[PDB]
């Protein structure tokens, strides 16, 4: 729980507990007992909805797909949806197991195949690579139940990179890849239907659990433009001859006059 | 078999529920956990860090670094220099660390630290009155109406910063993040106490401000943030 308010009477001190210095890079220790005369207040309030396990462990939508010809394909990434991407980019390194719930409006018999990295995924339904001996696969009927499975921490590191300031190739290379694109791939999920009846919309709701967040970062103050790319200059119109202008898409609102709000 | 029942709320997929799930890839040994410096366990520890309030968000200065400071001068009469309305949905607070953490939560309860720093030369001095009008009170528009609230008076010399602890004064136990008239937080106003006297006649100072959370600050009802949009598809 949060600390209680301590009582404080009138104080005439020579060491001020309210004159600090912003330049030292340390935040203030100032409580309300320094500035005013407080009373005792029993504070039973908690921040148990603000820890990383409760802040991030909520089952956000990570990706949408649409079955075109009884087939969908989604590579596992938190990068297509901006609301979970902002919450992950609060931090630099995140180590989490993830449970994956599939919400499909298809009626019939579906198959998910978690293709691990390094092999060819099935390029269609009725493909031969759906018949696999070792690729973990999930058969389910979407009526009477949603499927759910935990993918553990598959990292090649102690944590996932939310941000990477590096490249996968040395200096002389030409197809260099900035960012977190080469550092980790969580496989992909290949969807197919063995029936035909219902709809085509497949939603993938992924919940991070057993989370360990490692370096805090500023929350993003601009809308995302691409994925794996951290850009924020939105190029809105490609056709018309205002093409090379770039919107900013930030959230800082303006007030008409300071000292009047 | 053993008589069971499936009451309402059994075959439902709630996103925020806590359930166990079958481990795909069994026998998977994860990579080992090393000591990485800086581990954060609670996002309130991000909210408790001093972060600069964009106190000059006017329609020219946004998009520039000069929205983080206001310019003060030597005046004869006392002027209201700056007003920060104590709202976590106001763009002054909601773009900081404290505000962008507290904008994820529908309620908040605690005290705010607001630290003002004057960047000027080593000869410019000044006294400022930083007043917090409690909720229910009008914005003061006079220093005699502002000194009746929670105020501090800070001198300028040998250290540029001073912290006003905006205390938790409220009827209810929690204050709403999106500010309304029922749970409004009040106002913080910066005044000239005696002046700002620089070593020249037209000299200036640049007052910045940072805000953070006190240790007794709490949040609840985690919600979406209004500080994030998605209008296009990220491909």
């Amino acid at each position: 729980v949060v600390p209680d308010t301590k009582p404080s009477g009138p104080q005439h001190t020579t060491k001020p507990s309210i004159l600090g210095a912003m330049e030292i890079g340390a935040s203030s220790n100032a409580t309300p007992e320094s500035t005013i005369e407080t009373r005792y207040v029993y504070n039973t309030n908690t921040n148990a909805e603000a820890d990383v396990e409760m802040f991030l462990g909520r089952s956000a939508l990570w990706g949408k797909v649409t079955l075109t010809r009884q087939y969908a394909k989604w590579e596992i990434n938190f990068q297509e949806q901006a609301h979970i991407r902002k919450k992950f980019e609060f931090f630099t390194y995140l180590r989490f197991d993830m449970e994956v719930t599939i919400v499909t409006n298809n009626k019939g018999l579906m198959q998910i195949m978690f293709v691990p990295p390094g092999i060819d995924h099935p390029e269609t339904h009725d493909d031969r690579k759906w018949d696999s001996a070792s690729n973990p696969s999930v058969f389910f009927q979407p009526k009477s139940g949603f499927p759910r499975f935990t993918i553990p921490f598959t990292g090649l590191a102690s944590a996932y990179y939310m941000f990477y300031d590096g490249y996968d190739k040395p200096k002389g290379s030409d197809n260099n890849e900035y960012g977190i694109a080469p550092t980790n791939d969580m496989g992909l999920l290949c969807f197919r239907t063995l029936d035909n009846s219902g709809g085509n919309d497949v939603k993938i709701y992924v919940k991070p659990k057993h989370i360990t967040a490692w370096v805090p970062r500023p929350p993003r103050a601009t809308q995302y433009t691409h994925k794996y790319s951290t850009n924020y200059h939105y190029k809105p119109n490609s056709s018309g001859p205002d093409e090379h202008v770039l919107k900013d898409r930030h959230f800082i609102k303006t007030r008409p006059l300071i000292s009047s709000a | 078999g053993l008589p069971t029942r499936l009451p309402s709320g059994s075959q439902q997929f709630m996103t925020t529920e806590d359930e166990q799930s079958p481990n795909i890839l069994p026998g998977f040994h994860p990579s080992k956990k090393i000591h990485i410096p800086g581990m954060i366990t609670n996002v309130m520890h991000m909210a408790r860090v001093d972060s600069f309030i964009p106190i000059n968000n006017i329609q020219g200065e946004v998009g520039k670094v000069s929205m983080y400071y206001i310019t003060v001068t030597k005046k004869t009469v006392t002027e209201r220099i700056l007003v920060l309305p104590l709202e976590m949905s106001n763009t002054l607070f909601a773009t900081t660390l404290l505000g962008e953490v507290l904008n994820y939560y529908a309620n908040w309860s605690g005290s705010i630290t607001i630290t003002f720093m004057c960047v000027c030369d080593a000869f410019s001095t000044g006294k400022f009155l930083v007043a917090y009008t409690p909720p229910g009170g009008k914005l003061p528009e006079d220093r005699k109406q502002a000194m009746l609230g929670v105020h501090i008076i800070w001198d300028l010399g040998l250290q540029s910063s001073c912290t006003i602890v905006v205390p938790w004064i409220s009827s209810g136990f929690y204050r709403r993040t999106k500010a309304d008239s029922f749970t409004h937080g009040g106002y913080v106003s910066l005044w000239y106490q005696t002046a700002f006297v620089p070593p020249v006649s037209g000299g200036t100072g640049s007052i910045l401000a940072t805000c953070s959370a006190c240790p007794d600050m709490s949040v609840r009802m985690l919600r979406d943030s209004p500080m994030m949009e998605q209008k296009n598809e990220l491909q």
Partner: peptide, 25 residues
């Protein structure tokens, strides 16, 4: 507190500020 799947990853959700706000020497 039962683990119905006999795996550590299969469980539910699991459970100091001064590294920030005062990173001084």
């Amino acid at each position: 507190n039962i683990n119905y799947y006999k795996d550590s990853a299969s469980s539910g959700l699991s459970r100091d500020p001064s590294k920030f706000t005062q990173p001084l020497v």
